[PDB]
Design a protein around this ligand. Structure first.
Ligand code: VNM
Ligand code: VMV
Ligand code: 5HU
Ligand code: NA
Ligand code: NA
Ligand code: NA
Lengths: 264, 264
């Protein structure tokens, strides 16, 4: 995507060399923002093939409030493998915080249900937020959330969303993270009878790993292609009733996939 | 400031009409980002007179963990009067969440001490974060947090900070928000023996109130003046031990103040 390839070139040209948690090393910038008008097309990177199978199941898993990777296994999804405990648990990561944020007094807040009701009853609200950054449970989480915080917004019948990503592996993570939240905006918009607006991506520590450089130079040599179109084939009874089969990406004609080793 | 006046003009050129909680009406955009290199000067708006005294005291109050306006009144600061209850209490807003975020298992997390220790011991960490968005306590707060989430970053011996402001009153609120976080970066950098880097401001619902329009255009007719310079005159033994008199602002030569009504 044009904005994505501009970010990748900016990190190369302007990033500072950092040592990181993994010992791999990165080039890093701090603070970036991109905007995708979702009526221009679904923002799925075209300069390498990105597989949505795993994205979609993961988002459906988040929405079910699930943090045990069994559901992912049942669908041959392995991306949470490293971090699950001997019983297949990750602790209270995204799904738990989205669906059952615990109050200090033993109650719970369903942030997804709250946002749905805010969009349907108070669409002008400036407080339509889902946060995974539960400070009091970070220690129990298998991994600290990268997509920390997102906010919805309604203007002129269009639903927009902004994601704050505290830490962004530009090569391996960001294509999938953009697609996940773009998919969620379409789902939310459908359940609230809204049109789709913008997906705004904001990054904190935005980096390229030092062993992703050959892959980065290859990708930057490729020209982007027109964006595909997301079709939702069925309107479920609620945001919690979608199925993998409900989604079709029409007209996705990407360049070949690019493999690179993940920093553990 | 150049960046601030460009934001005002963008809301005016690109914003849409929204009703709002307060009944006033706004012109708003969703998603914005701007940067202030703090080595260029202290980013206190010059195209109207802004009163740094309230900004400083409010920040010292936050850092104490206080959420009652009595301290502010001891120092003739009235900016929180409209939302306090009969006893001066705001509920568990910024200061409480910064210093003592309550967990479900009875603990409290001092996020300011946490990020100070991360900056001293693990400055490459990608999760040097303070959040005020405590979902489980929003209903106890007089106002939901506007400057909701911020992240620190270190490169080339300089401390940077990014704020996610989910809701921004551009004319009345934003000048105070920018200066407050810039001051905090200087204080943190002092305590960590770092130089100052960038303050990155990111906005969610970024709006001009309908009854701020004549004031906004008056300000836009003015040329920014040179940024003032912040001098800190002591190194306290901790981030919690600063005093109002430790700060001096040099070379602040603003255009006249512009009065506007706050939306309650
Ligand atoms: N959907 C999603 N994506 C994730 N990437 C992701 C998860 N779920 C959940 C967990 C973990 C999964 N880890 C993996 C990601 C990718 C592969 C992998 O090899 N994929 C292939 C094949 C895929 C396919 O076939 O379709 C391929 O893609 O080709 C393996 C494991 N993550 C977190 C995550 C991390 N990071 C960065 C920021 C920092 O570099 C560092 C954090 O470290 P720190 O705490 O110090 O900041 O990980 C992001 O940027 N975004 C993120 O979501
Ligand atoms: N809608 C809304 N709600 C909030 N709670 C909120 C904000 N906006 C924005 C920032 C913060 C509240 N801080 C302030 C900041 C400034 C003033 C103020 O009075 N400024 C004028 C004087 C006006 C006059 O004399 O008529 C000046 O600068 O001279 C009041 C409160 N929080
Ligand atoms: O620091 C601030 N900066 C700021 O701009 N505001 C403004 C944003 C909104 O106009 C208003 C909050 O109202 P609301 O929760 O509906 O967004 O106060 C409020 C605060 C309070 O800290
Ligand atoms: Na940038
Ligand atoms: Na504590
Ligand atoms: Na003190």
């Amino acid at each position: 995507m044009k904005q994505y390839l501009e970010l990748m070139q900016k990190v190369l040209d302007e990033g500072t060399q950092k040592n990181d948690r993994t010992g791999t090393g990165t080039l890093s910038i701090f603070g970036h923002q991109m905007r995708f008008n979702l009526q221009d097309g679904f923002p799925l990177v075209t300069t390498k093939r990105c597989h949505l199978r795993s994205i979609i199941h993961e988002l459906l898993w988040f929405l079910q409030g699930d943090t045990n990777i069994a559901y992912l296994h049942e669908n041959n999804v392995t991306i949470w493998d490293e971090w699950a405990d001997e019983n297949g648990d990750l602790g209270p990561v995204y799904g738990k915080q989205w669906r059952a944020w615990p109050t200090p007094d033993g109650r719970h807040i369903d942030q997804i249900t709250t946002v749905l009701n805010q969009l349907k009853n108070d669409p002008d609200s400036r407080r339509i937020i889902v946060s995974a950054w539960n400070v009091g449970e970070l220690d129990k989480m298998a991994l600290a959330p990268c997509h920390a915080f997102f906010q919805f917004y309604v203007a002129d019948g269009k639903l927009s969303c902004q994601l704050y990503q505290r830490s962004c592996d530009v090569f391996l993570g960001l294509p999938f993270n953009i697609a996940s939240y773009a998919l969620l905006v379409h789902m939310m918009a459908q359940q609230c009878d809204l049109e789709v607006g913008d997906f705004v991506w904001t990054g904190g520590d935005t980096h390229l790993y030092s062993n992703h450089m050959d892959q980065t130079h290859l990708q930057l040599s490729r020209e982007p292609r027109p964006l595909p179109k997301l079709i939702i084939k069925r309107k479920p009874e609620s945001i919690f009733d979608y199925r993998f089969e409900d989604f079709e990406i029409e007209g996705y004609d990407p360049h070949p996939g690019i493999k690179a080793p993940v920093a553990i």
